[PDB]
Enzyme design. Structure first.
Site, PDB file in Angstrom:
ATOM      1  N   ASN A 155     -85.669  72.759 -27.497  1.00 54.77           N
ATOM      2  CA  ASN A 155     -86.204  71.635 -28.080  1.00 54.77           C
ATOM      3  C   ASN A 155     -87.415  72.164 -28.858  1.00 54.77           C
ATOM      4  O   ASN A 155     -88.487  72.522 -28.489  1.00 54.77           O
ATOM      5  CB  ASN A 155     -86.598  70.591 -27.267  1.00 54.77           C
ATOM      6  CG  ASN A 155     -85.527  69.716 -26.489  1.00 54.77           C
ATOM      7  OD1 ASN A 155     -84.319  70.138 -26.354  1.00 54.77           O
ATOM      8  ND2 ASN A 155     -85.955  68.749 -25.767  1.00 54.77           N
ATOM      9  N   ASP A 165     -48.568  99.596 -34.280  1.00 48.93           N
ATOM     10  CA  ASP A 165     -47.815  99.299 -33.032  1.00 48.93           C
ATOM     11  C   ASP A 165     -49.253  99.104 -32.099  1.00 48.93           C
ATOM     12  O   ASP A 165     -50.005  99.892 -31.830  1.00 48.93           O
ATOM     13  CB  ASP A 165     -47.151 100.321 -32.444  1.00 48.93           C
ATOM     14  CG  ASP A 165     -46.520  99.840 -31.059  1.00 48.93           C
ATOM     15  OD1 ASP A 165     -46.898  98.990 -30.569  1.00 48.93           O
ATOM     16  OD2 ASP A 165     -45.326 100.648 -30.858  1.00 48.93           O
ATOM     17  N   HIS A 220     -82.829  73.022 -31.959  1.00 51.60           N
ATOM     18  CA  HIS A 220     -82.822  71.983 -32.289  1.00 51.60           C
ATOM     19  C   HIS A 220     -84.121  71.052 -32.513  1.00 51.60           C
ATOM     20  O   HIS A 220     -85.030  70.855 -31.799  1.00 51.60           O
ATOM     21  CB  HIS A 220     -81.495  71.112 -32.018  1.00 51.60           C
ATOM     22  CG  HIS A 220     -81.760  70.486 -30.598  1.00 51.60           C
ATOM     23  ND1 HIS A 220     -82.253  69.403 -30.536  1.00 51.60           N
ATOM     24  CD2 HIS A 220     -81.707  71.105 -29.482  1.00 51.60           C
ATOM     25  CE1 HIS A 220     -82.141  69.129 -29.017  1.00 51.60           C
ATOM     26  NE2 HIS A 220     -81.876  70.082 -28.337  1.00 51.60           N
ATOM     27  N   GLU A 276     -46.604  96.641 -26.591  1.00 60.68           N
ATOM     28  CA  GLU A 276     -45.723  95.397 -26.147  1.00 60.68           C
ATOM     29  C   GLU A 276     -44.837  94.698 -27.124  1.00 60.68           C
ATOM     30  O   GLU A 276     -44.641  93.638 -27.259  1.00 60.68           O
ATOM     31  CB  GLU A 276     -46.369  94.209 -25.379  1.00 60.68           C
ATOM     32  CG  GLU A 276     -47.097  95.083 -23.806  1.00 60.68           C
ATOM     33  CD  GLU A 276     -47.752  94.006 -23.212  1.00 60.68           C
ATOM     34  OE1 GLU A 276     -47.792  92.874 -23.383  1.00 60.68           O
ATOM     35  OE2 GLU A 276     -48.698  94.401 -22.504  1.00 60.68           O
ATOM     36  N   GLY A 277     -44.392  95.622 -28.236  1.00 55.97           N
ATOM     37  CA  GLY A 277     -43.847  95.319 -29.490  1.00 55.97           C
ATOM     38  C   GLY A 277     -44.757  94.267 -30.245  1.00 55.97           C
ATOM     39  O   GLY A 277     -43.949  93.710 -31.050  1.00 55.97           O
ATOM     40  N   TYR A 304     -73.082  59.385 -22.758  1.00 57.94           N
ATOM     41  CA  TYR A 304     -73.908  59.282 -23.795  1.00 57.94           C
ATOM     42  C   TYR A 304     -73.604  60.049 -24.984  1.00 57.94           C
ATOM     43  O   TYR A 304     -72.676  60.950 -24.979  1.00 57.94           O
ATOM     44  CB  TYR A 304     -75.256  59.660 -23.395  1.00 57.94           C
ATOM     45  CG  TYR A 304     -75.287  61.241 -23.074  1.00 57.94           C
ATOM     46  CD1 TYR A 304     -75.408  62.263 -24.003  1.00 57.94           C
ATOM     47  CD2 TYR A 304     -75.074  61.676 -21.763  1.00 57.94           C
ATOM     48  CE1 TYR A 304     -75.525  63.653 -23.749  1.00 57.94           C
ATOM     49  CE2 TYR A 304     -75.144  63.008 -21.265  1.00 57.94           C
ATOM     50  CZ  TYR A 304     -75.431  63.906 -22.184  1.00 57.94           C
ATOM     51  OH  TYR A 304     -75.271  65.055 -21.931  1.00 57.94           O
ATOM     52  N   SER A 343     -72.140  79.499 -25.168  1.00 59.04           N
ATOM     53  CA  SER A 343     -72.238  78.685 -23.878  1.00 59.04           C
ATOM     54  C   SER A 343     -72.885  77.612 -24.164  1.00 59.04           C
ATOM     55  O   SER A 343     -72.799  76.537 -23.418  1.00 59.04           O
ATOM     56  CB  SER A 343     -73.118  79.563 -22.861  1.00 59.04           C
ATOM     57  OG  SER A 343     -74.422  79.709 -23.232  1.00 59.04           O
ATOM     58  N   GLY A 344     -73.397  77.204 -25.386  1.00 68.96           N
ATOM     59  CA  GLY A 344     -73.783  75.947 -25.877  1.00 68.96           C
ATOM     60  C   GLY A 344     -75.371  75.893 -26.013  1.00 68.96           C
ATOM     61  O   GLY A 344     -75.868  74.627 -26.106  1.00 68.96           O
ATOM     62  N   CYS A 398     -80.957  73.581 -24.136  1.00 71.40           N
ATOM     63  CA  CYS A 398     -81.331  74.043 -25.420  1.00 71.40           C
ATOM     64  C   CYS A 398     -82.838  74.257 -25.673  1.00 71.40           C
ATOM     65  O   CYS A 398     -83.641  73.702 -24.782  1.00 71.40           O
ATOM     66  CB  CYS A 398     -80.738  73.051 -26.252  1.00 71.40           C
ATOM     67  SG  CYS A 398     -79.006  73.016 -26.514  1.00 71.40           S
TER      68      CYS A 398
HETATM   69  S1  LIG Z   1     -78.054  71.613 -25.188  1.00 72.82           S
HETATM   70  C1  LIG Z   1     -78.266  70.069 -25.641  1.00 72.82           C
HETATM   71  C2  LIG Z   1     -78.697  69.740 -26.856  1.00 72.82           C
HETATM   72  C3  LIG Z   1     -78.736  68.276 -27.256  1.00 72.82           C
HETATM   73  C4  LIG Z   1     -78.218  67.366 -26.243  1.00 72.82           C
HETATM   74  N1  LIG Z   1     -78.366  66.073 -26.425  1.00 72.82           N
HETATM   75  O1  LIG Z   1     -77.838  65.086 -25.556  1.00 72.82           O
HETATM   76  O2  LIG Z   1     -79.388  65.590 -27.258  1.00 72.82           O
HETATM   77  C5  LIG Z   1     -77.761  67.786 -24.824  1.00 72.82           C
HETATM   78  C6  LIG Z   1     -77.479  66.868 -23.987  1.00 72.82           C
HETATM   79  O3  LIG Z   1     -78.212  66.389 -23.102  1.00 72.82           O
HETATM   80  O4  LIG Z   1     -76.043  66.807 -23.761  1.00 72.82           O
HETATM   81  C7  LIG Z   1     -77.507  69.617 -24.729  1.00 72.82           C
END
Ligand SMILES: *Sc1ccc([N+](=O)[O-])c(C(=O)O)c1
Length: 258
Positions: free
Chosen positions: A207, A83, A187, A86-87, A169, A182-183, A205
């Site tokens: 880079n 349980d 990369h 709330e059931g 874009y 959050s993103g 990000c």
């Molecule tokens: S956090 C992030 C990584 C890459 C890219 N990109 O467009 O290459 C973005 C962004 O500018 O939207 C954001």
């Protein structure tokens, strides 16, 4: 009136020293205490850990400090018929078993604009980086490595702008490793190699060069750590999803079941 638990990490996986145990239900849990009582976590070597909820669907368990490499972890989620308030009743049991791999901790210092990767204490890479611009800074804090992508399209719809509109874009990105919900990603950014080590140019990000991004992709795994320091940003939320270590131990241990 049934809710299914889902457990991470994956059964049989090797994860980094920052990986929490995660149990996410497909419905909100009214009785958090009932859910915690039904989950039994065993470690070898033995180490204490504790539960903390990130939101109404998902509970995390971790130790006070990063895991010792080699630790074996068994997770028994014994929720069938329980349980949960709330059931709502647990639809099934789940389990997982995993182990901890090498200690991999990368530190990005805004004072030097270098991302330094340490593997079991040894400095193995010193990567020039370009982080978020002053208006869109990268948050300081401890980030847990999540998923990795050989190639991903990062586009304007992430910020609410359609790709085919005048300010839209879409960007082909290689060797992207997620470090926050959050993103934030580490990369490949060929377009900013001149700025890396010198100037912050991104939306948040980290880079790095194509070579370094591929190296990072190949040598990091889920649960490894990235720590960001000295930026003009704030601090990554403890409840991000990959931000768990930003909550101090006494707060985490005390929990939020009630
Ligand atoms: S956090 C992030 C990584 C890459 C890219 N990109 O467009 O290459 C973005 C962004 O500018 O939207 C954001």
């Amino acid at each position: 009136h049934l809710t299914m638990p889902y457990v991470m990490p994956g059964d049989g996986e090797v994860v980094g020293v920052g990986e929490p145990v995660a149990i996410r239900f497909d419905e909100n849990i009214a009785d958090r205490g009932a859910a915690e009582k039904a989950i039994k976590i065993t470690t070898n070597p033995p180490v204490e850990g504790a539960f903390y909820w990130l939101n109404n669907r998902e509970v995390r368990w971790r130790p006070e400090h990063f895991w010792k490499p080699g630790t074996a972890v068994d997770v028994a989620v014994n929720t069938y018929g329980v349980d949960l308030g709330e059931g709502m009743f647990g639809e099934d049991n789940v389990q997982t078993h995993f182990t901890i791999g090498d200690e991999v901790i990368a530190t990005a210092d805004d004072n030097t604009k270098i991302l330094t990767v340490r593997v079991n204490g040894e400095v193995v890479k010193s990567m020039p980086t370009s982080m978020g611009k002053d208006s869109t800074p990268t948050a300081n804090g401890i980030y847990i490595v999540g998923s990795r992508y050989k190639h991903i399209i990062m586009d304007s719809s992430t910020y609410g702008v359609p790709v085919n509109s005048p300010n839209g874009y879409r960007t082909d990105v290689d060797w992207a490793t997620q470090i926050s919900y959050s993103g934030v990603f580490v990369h490949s950014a060929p377009w900013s190699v001149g700025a890396q080590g010198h100037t912050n140019t991104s939306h948040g990000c980290l880079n790095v060069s194509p070579s370094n991004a591929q190296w990072f992709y190949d040598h990091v795994k889920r649960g490894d750590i990235v720590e960001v320091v000295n930026t003009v940003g704030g601090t990554l939320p403890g409840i991000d999803g990959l931000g768990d270590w930003n909550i101090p131990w006494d707060q985490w241990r005390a929990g939020n079941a009630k």
